[PDB]
């Protein structure tokens, strides 16, 4: 149905010097593709 996507991103952490990879599900409606035309890069609407 492609209503959901599995996305990865660098989320911030308790310390400003560190970042943590986070995997999470998002609804397709909340997401807009970035026009690199690769289809893999996205941003929140």
């Amino acid at each position, epitope marked *: 149905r492609e209503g959901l996507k599995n996305c990865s991103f660098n989320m911030t*952490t308790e310390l400003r*010097d*560190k*970042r*943590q*990879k986070v995997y999470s599900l998002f609804y397709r409606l909340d997401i807009v593709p970035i026009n690199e035309n690769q289809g893999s890069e996205y941003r929140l609407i």
Partner: antibody, heavy 133, light 108 residues
Framework: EVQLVESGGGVVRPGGSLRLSCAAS????????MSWVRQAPGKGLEWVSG????????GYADSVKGRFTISRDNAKNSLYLQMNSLRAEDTALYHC??????????????????????????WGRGTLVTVSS | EIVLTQSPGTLSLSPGERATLSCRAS???????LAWYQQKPGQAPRLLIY???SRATGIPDRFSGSGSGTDFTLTISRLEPEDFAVYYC?????????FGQGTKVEIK
């Protein structure tokens, strides 16, 4: 439990090609970058190539650059190396090695789970590759 | 491009003696990235130090080191019979990462 297992080794005529693979288990594969390191008998270690956690970054030693390609399949928890235009000089024991689970930006910012191929805390037994007429 | 060199190529000390190894880069090492490894014949190598001075997990205080610029040193406070091995320095600082020629410490 934690291990790396090399496969795909063998004897190949020069000018030919061979694909190597490395199975891995006991840890999250997606969190680490990886490298291949080779050692001829009687010789020291030589870095061959390496790949970051998503395959977005690669690098090759000058001695193999342009003849080798490195790739990975995170879904299969496996690392692959394609070796082309093999030469007698390439004969060595090849080791699969786990890279770091984090990388550092130019700003000094650390990223965890975004692994890279700098240094190796885990090594496999390796597999032999021989090049002969 | 960047080549590491190491000395002495061979060392021979009795067990319990203090020992050091030297590694010198042809070019300066960025951010003290240089790291050290240990190997015995018939075995895959292990990592004693990550970064110039920080020990890997499971590495006792017996192993230590420091350095800057092109010049780095590994120190062993005392040699255990288990510590006789081939040692290497690697540079994570610039592509391609390279391993020095290494040194050997032996009683046999």
């Amino acid at each position: 439990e934690v291990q790396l297992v090399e496969s795909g080794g063998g004897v190949v005529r020069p000018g030919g090609s061979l694909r190597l693979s490395c199975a891995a288990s006991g840890f999250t594969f997606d969190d680490y970058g990886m490298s291949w390191v080779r050692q001829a008998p009687g010789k020291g270690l030589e870095w061959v190539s390496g790949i970051n956690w998503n395959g977005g970054s690669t690098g090759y030693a000058d001695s193999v650059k342009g003849r080798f390609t490195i790739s990975r399949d995170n879904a299969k928890n496996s690392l692959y190396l394609q070796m082309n235009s093999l030469r007698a000089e390439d004969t060595a024991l090849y080791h699969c090695a786990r890279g770091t689970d984090y990388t550092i930006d130019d700003q000094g910012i650390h990223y965890y789970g975004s692994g890279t191929y700098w240094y190796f805390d885990l090594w496999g037994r390796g597999t032999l590759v021989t090049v002969s007429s | 491009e960047i080549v590491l060199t190491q000395s002495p190529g061979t060392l021979s000390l009795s067990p319990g003696e203090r020992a050091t190894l030297s590694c010198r880069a042809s070019q300066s090492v960025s951010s003290s990235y240089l790291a050290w490894y240990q190997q015995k014949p018939g075995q895959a190598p292990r990592l004693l130090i990550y970064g110039a001075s920080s020990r890997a997990t499971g590495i006792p205080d017996r192993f230590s080191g420091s350095g800057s610029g092109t010049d780095f040193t590994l120190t062993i406070s005392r040699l255990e019979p288990e510590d006789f091995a081939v040692y290497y320095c690697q540079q994570y600082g610039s592509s391609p990462y390279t391993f020095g020629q290494g040194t050997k410490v032996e009683i046999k």
